[PDB]
């Protein structure tokens, strides 16, 4: 059981807006953005449950591009070596952020043949800090089992 | 003196359309797209002259993404090792194409902090073939001394 702060902003694929995970408690059957680890591309994926795991100690993780999230010590992030717990990460280690690049011709027509292959931006960690006890939440994403929260790829429930 | 076929399509920065270089003969004071070799970014740049060098033997060069141009044997293209003549290139050698990537957030806001640094796509050569004698043209780009023709970075006159 791992989880994230209720303030964490979930990117919602149907609306193009974000909502904090706490505000989605008890909602379901909505789409988030997930990485497909086989293709390294982002796909929309359905949330089947959003739940609170109680009050837990959370830690703020920050990356070089300023992405930040508060998560439990056992919460997993995606490194080049696979999924790793927050309390196993070290500074300068890269974690996966989503990236959305579009490739156009000089005439502003689509030019997908020049698109970089992966939808991941690998960003180094610059801070990991114990922050305090908060109500924490997670969600279930059957199939791909990950989602974007605060513009970071995080693992869903197991 | 090197040159390209009159059919070669010049990307015009003000209009977002292309025109064959022959149709620009005698025109000037218009902007094309050029690579800045110091920053590796594309910039608009002014054409001061468009001229015909006569009838010359031209060669078709083609890359893996299907970019193709007809140019003289001494016409230069940009490799990772600098500018090289058509008659010095070999198959699988990469040459520079422009690329225009845009980086957006998952909410479709600009997200330039994740943009790849270079505006070049390095594409391998798949064919170099003597084609025939044609009227050929080039142009002068003071300062950056290159331009995009048939979606390939080519050197301007000297």
Residue numbers in the entry:
A (entry chain A), B (entry chain A): -1 to 156
The authors write:
The importance of steric demand was confirmed by the crystal structure of the M86 precursor intein with the G(–1)F mutation and revealed a constraint imposed around the scissile bond. The sterically demanding Phe side chain in the M86(G(–1)F) mutant is partially squeezed between the His73 imidazole side chain and the N-terminal scissile bond, pushing both moieties slightly apart. The distance between the imidazole ring of the histidine side chain and the amide nitrogen of Ala1 increased from 2.9 Å in the M86 structure (with the π-nitrogen as reference point) to 3.2 or 4.3 Å in the G(–1)F mutant (δ-carbon as reference point), for which two very similar His73 conformers can be observed, indicating increased mobility of this residue. Consistent with this interpretation is a re-orientation of the His73 imidazole ring, which is flipped in both conformers of the G(–1)F mutant, such that its δ-nitrogen is not facing the amide nitrogen anymore. Instead, the flipped imidazole ring of one of the His73 conformers is stabilized directly by the key Asp136 residue of the block F motif, which also displays a rotated side chain relative to the M86 structure and is within the H-bonding distance of 2.9 Å to the imidazole ring. The flipped orientation of the other His73 conformer in the G(–1)F mutant is assisted by a water molecule (water 145) that is not present in the M86 structure and establishes hydrogen bonds to both the Asp136 side chain and the imidazole moiety.
Inteins are protein elements that remove themselves from their precursor proteins in an autocatalytic pathway called protein splicing. In the first step of the canonical class 1 inteins, the scissile peptide bond upstream of the intein rearranges in an N–S (or N–O) acyl shift involving the cysteine (or serine) side chain as the first amino acid of the intein (residue 1) and the upstream flanking amino acid of the N-extein (residue (–1)). The M86 mutant of the Ssp DnaB intein (here referred to as WT intein) was selected by sequential directed evolution for its more general activity and is one of the few known intein mutants with improved extein promiscuity.
